[PDB]
Structures are given as structure tokens and as C-alpha cells.
């Protein structure tokens, strides 16, 4: 997260770590007791390492009580996710059992309606991702506030240039950003889980380069299809 | 496959309004702006300025500050450019361009500024 | 209020030959630059895009080159179906900006 501050702990019980080899890779976002939904280019990042994913946590390196590593039963990616595409980045990750739930670990519910969310909205963004260029991965979560921005603006060729699907939304990034390690990780908007930082080569707090989001409303099927 | 077309041909007085339709297609309209662009007889290309399509905020270029007005219609997915009082210097060819994506122009639309 | 300066007005060149066109930016737009061809009669075609990406189907002699405030426009091997008028445009921020163009003539 670029431009952001350390988030208050546990105040999003349900922010997931996805780890490789005991590191943190990815965000994720626990949907369900048994699952936590991250972005399909993670578990490619991951490739042979053991994937694992934490709950409860604040600080990646200090133990709590709060804190428990899950083992992963079942790595589902979106089966039209390709690696040279940003395209369908949804991955469902199913836990070795369902998740102690408490005032730390509690499972976010995910927008069903598809319906767009309104430029200009608030949406907060959190995660364990880059908090400058050179690259620091920070020990405890950060988060951002950022104003959501409309798809015509975020399309200019300029930008994206007409990568922006209907199934893709976009946040302002100039200085305030979701960088890399954030991808997978949630941006909620009103209490509601809206979108999955998507994975890319983008370089973070760019104008020129808004913030992409996966939105989970699009996949709503997919979704509920793997939950069950 | 996209396409881009816009209306045709006009003659008008000096001192009228004119009102050029760019109809959109083969793409959701609302996730592409629109630039619209003018080219005067034996003359280069000049940008005019955009809107964006889904929250309908436009910008101008500075020489096209003041008669221009750009609007829409997101039920015919079709962008419309109004030039008011009409000056026989208006007289030019008027495209629509789709902003972002595989590059898309409209056909152009001819307005003739004459008594 | 982004200006450009596009050079030359016009030239003259023989099947084969490199023609080569030139777009100075007032400001720095890093790799904001696009070229497109007009042929006579005919609606603009986007050659070239932002960090002089060559768009399918045109052929590879046509290439962009520059970051910055300066960019060229290199068509490698003239062939007389390239006889148009050539516009840079800068897409750094509202509102773009073409240049005056440059009317590309076969000498045979």
C-alpha cells in the first residue's frame, strides 16, 4: 500500500495473508469459514512452494493468540485466467479446516448485486504489499481510503486503454496506491466487499496507471458455485 | 465488430446552431470516451476535446472554448457535438473518435457555413 | 495547453528511402506520443501508440522512437502507398494535441 498508514489491528478480521513458504505473497479476503478469495496470478507466483494462509494477523514477523497459519486443501483459479492476461484474476483457496471465528478472524460479505460502485466512492484498499519503491515490505498492515474512478476515464489511452472490462473496475492512484504484494487483497466499500486488487506489471502511485480491481459481483456464480 | 457512425452532410447560415450525431457500436459505450476532432478544408487535424461517456464531464481545448458543446444519449449509445453561432470558419469536416482500445473513427460529418 | 511542434511541413522522398518526422512537446509527457497517417480522402489511422508501440496490422517500417519532449516518426523503407499527410498527437493529459503535420510526397 503506497500512501496509506498502519490500519488499527484487527479491525478487518477478515484480511487473509496468502503465504508461500512461510512468506507473505498475496492478500486474500476470507468469503466463507473454509475460503479465501485472492487473484488467480498468485498461485502462478506461488508455483512449488507450500501455500498457506494467515488469519488473525497484524504483524507478519510477532506471534498472538489471534494469529493462526492454515494449511490449503484446494487451490480453485478462475478456469479463464490466462498469464499474459489480467482477465478473470479470481482465486478461491479452501482452508485444511474451517476457520476459528472471533473478534479477529470473521469471514466479509461480498457483493452479489452487479451493479457498479459509483466514481468517486471511498473504497478502502488494505494489505502487507510495498509502502515505497525500493521495494519495503512492511511488518504490519497498512490500508488507503481511495476515491473510486469511472471506466470511460480509466480506458483513455493514456491509461489502461481499453483493458477496463465491465468485470474490472478502477481507484485513483496518483500517490495513494495498492502496489505490488496488495494484489488478492480486498477493497471495500461500505461495509461491502467490492473488488480483488488485480495482479499485474503495473508500476504503483502513478496517475497514469489507476489501481485495478476484480469485481467479485461479476463472478457471483463462479463464486457460489465453489463455496458449496 | 466496432463501428462509428455519424450523420451527414449539413449546410447552415451563419449565426445558426448545428447538432452532429456519432452512433456507437459493437462496444459498451459508456466504457470508452469520445474525442471529437475538426479538420477545415486543405487544413490538419485539430483536437476539439472529449467526453467521457459514462459520467458525461467534457473538456475542450482552449480554441474550442465557448460555442462547443458536447452531449450524450447511453439508450442509442450516441454522442452528439452542438456548434453555436455558426461562422463560415466552422466550415470543416467534424470526426468522432472512440478513446482507448483498437483505434475507431467515425466517418466524419461535413458542415458547410454559407448564405 | 500541451503545445507541439511537428517538422517538417512537407518532403519529398523515392521509393526505399527512410523518411524521417519529428514532434517536440512543450512539456514532458514521458512516452505519451502517437502518430497517425491521413491518406488522401480518406479518415485518420493510429500507427503508432503511447511508447511507440507499432499497432497490428501496420507494417514494421513504420516505427516511433523518443521519451521525453522528443519523438520521431521513422518510415524505414518509403513505398508509394505511403504518400499521406502525418500527425503526431500527444496523450499525456486533456486536452491531446496534434501537431501541424508533415505531407509525405513520393519523388519518382
Known amino acids: 500500500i503506497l500512501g496509506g498508514r498502519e490500519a488499527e489491528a484487527h479491525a478487518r478480521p477478515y484480511m487473509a495473508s496468502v503465504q508461500v513458504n512461510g512468506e507473505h505473497l498475496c492478500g486474500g479476503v476470507l468469503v466463507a469459514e473454509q475460503w479465501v478469495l485472492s487473484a488467480a496470478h498468485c498461485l502462478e507466483d506461488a508455483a512449488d512452494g507450500k501455500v498457506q494462509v494467515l488469519l488473525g494477523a497484524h504483524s507478519l514477523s510477532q506471534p498472538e493468540p489471534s494469529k493462526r497459519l492454515y494449511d490449503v486443501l484446494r487451490a480453485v483459479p478462475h478456469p479463464d485466467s490466462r498469464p499474459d492476461t489480467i482477465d478473470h484474476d479470481l482465486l478461491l483457496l479452501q482452508l485444511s479446516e474451517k476457520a476459528t471465528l472471533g473478534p479477529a478472524v470473521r469471514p466479509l460479505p461480498w457483493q452479489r448485486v452487479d451493479r457498479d460502485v459509483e466514481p468517486g466512492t471511498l473504497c478502502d484498499v488494505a494489505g502487507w504489499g510495498i509502502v515505497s519503491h525500493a521495494g519495503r515490505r512492511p511488518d504490519r498492515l497498512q490500508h488507503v481510503l481511495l476515491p473510486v474512478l469511472d471506466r470511460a476515464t480509466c480506458n483513455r489511452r493514456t491509461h489502461h486503454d481499453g483493458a477496463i472490462t465491465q468485470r474490472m473496475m478502477c481507484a485513483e492512484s496518483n500517490r495513494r496506491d495498492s502496489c505490488k504484494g496488495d494484489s488478492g487483497g480486498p477493497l471495500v466499500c461500505g461495509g461491502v466487499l467490492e473488488g480483488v486488487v488485480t495482479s499485474g506489471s503495473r508500476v504503483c502511485g502513478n496517475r497514469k496507471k489507476p489501481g485495478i480491481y476484480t469485481r467479485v459481483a461479476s463472478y457471483a456464480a463462479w463464486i457460489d458455485s465453489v463455496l458449496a | 465488430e466496432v463501428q462509428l457512425v455519424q450523420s451527414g452532410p449539413e449546410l447552415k447560415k451563419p449565426g445558426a446552431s448545428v447538432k452532429v450525431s456519432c452512433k456507437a457500436s459493437?462496444?459498451?459505450?459508456?466504457?470508452?470516451?469520445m474525442n471529437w476532432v475538426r479538420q477545415a478544408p486543405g487544413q490538419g487535424l485539430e483536437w476539439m476535446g472529449w467526453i467521457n461517456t459514462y459520467t458525461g464531464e467534457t473538456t475542450y481545448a482552449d480554441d474550442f472554448k465557448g460555442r462547443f458543446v458536447f452531449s450524450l444519449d447511453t439508450s442509442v449509445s450516441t454522442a452528439y457535438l452542438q456548434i453555436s453561432s455558426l461562422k463560415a470558419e466552422d466550415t470543416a469536416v467534424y470526426y468522432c473518435?472512440?478513446?482507448?482500445?483498437?483505434?475507431?473513427w467515425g466517418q466524419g460529418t461535413l458542415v458547410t457555413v454559407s448564405s | 495547453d500541451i503545445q507541439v511542434t511537428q517538422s517538417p511541413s512537407s518532403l519529398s522522398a523515392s521509393v526505399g528511402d527512410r523518411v524521417t518526422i519529428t514532434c517536440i512537446t512543450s512539456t514532458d509527457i514521458d512516452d505519451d506520443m502517437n502518430w497517425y497517417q491521413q491518406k488522401p480522402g480518406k479518415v485518420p489511422k493510429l500507427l503508432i501508440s503511447?511508447?511507440?508501440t507499432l499497432r497490428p496490422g501496420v507494417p514494421s517500417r513504420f516505427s516511433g522512437s523518443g521519451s521525453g519532449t522528443d519523438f520521431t516518426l521513422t518510415i524505414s523503407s518509403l513505398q508509394p502507398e505511403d504518400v499521406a499527410t502525418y500527425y503526431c498527437?500527444?496523450?499525456?493529459?486533456?486536452?491531446?494535441?496534434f501537431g501541424q503535420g508533415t505531407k509525405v510526397e513520393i519523388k519518382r
Open positions: 459493437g462496444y459498451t459505450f459508456t466504457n470508452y470516451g
Open positions: 473518435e472512440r478513446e482507448g482500445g483498437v483505434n475507431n
Open positions: 503511447g511508447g511507440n
Open positions: 498527437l500527444q496523450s499525456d493529459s486533456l486536452p491531446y494535441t
